[PDB]
Hints:
Blueprint: E1 2-10, H1 16-25, E2 38-46, E3 49-57, H2 61-66, E4 69-75, H3 79-83, H4 85-96, E5 103-108, H5 119-129, E6 133-135, H6 144-159
Parallel strand pairs: 1-3, 1-4, 4-5, 5-6
Antiparallel strand pairs: 2-3
This protein binds ligand A1I08 and magnesium ion.
Amino acid sequence: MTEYKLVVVGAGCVGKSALTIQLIQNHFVDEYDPTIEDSYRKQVVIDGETSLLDILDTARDQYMRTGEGFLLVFAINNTKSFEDIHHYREQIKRVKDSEDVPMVLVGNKSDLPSRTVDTKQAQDLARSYGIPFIETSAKTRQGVDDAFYTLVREIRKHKE
Ligand SMILES: *CCC(=O)N[C@H]1CCCN(C(=O)O[C@H]2[C@@H](O)[C@H](n3cnc4c(=O)[nH]c(N)nc43)O[C@@H]2COP(=O)(O)OP(=O)(O)O)C1
Ligand SMILES: [Mg+2]
């Protein structure tokens, strides 16, 4: 089976861990330790192809070198976390020495009403980067599979 090393990055408290845990364990862990940086593995079938996902939940430079695709996560109720996205993307470009790195922009906490980052803002940013944008809720699981599977599809497109 093919293996994909994915890396989840973004400001603190945006939901990187909650998203990863939903993908791996299929439940919403609300109070997860904010300091645990670790990799999780799960065998899934994506578009009929069996894949082993090796996902690093960031909170280290060994996985930025080996990571094949990156989830850029902000929270839709956290303007600063969206402003920080550019920093994370630039840091990945620097380590990869490349402008063509599979990435997906993720706007998490879509269940909340207290939104300060417009969907149009995020779509504008993703368009500028040339990457997909997916809105998620780790709480309700909305969009969680879509975010990670979309990233795998971008790595597959990249390799082909
Ligand atoms: C950082 C400030 C903060 O959120 N403080 C606390 C007060 C008490 C506990 N509570 C909490 O644990 O929030 C977690 C988590 O439940 C929440 N979260 C994550 N994803 C979602 C989502 O999709 N919808 C909603 N309504 N809440 C979500 O946010 C924090 C942080 O989650 P995390 O540890 O996964 O974030 P990481 O630092 O990026 O890993 C709020
Ligand atoms: Mg975390």
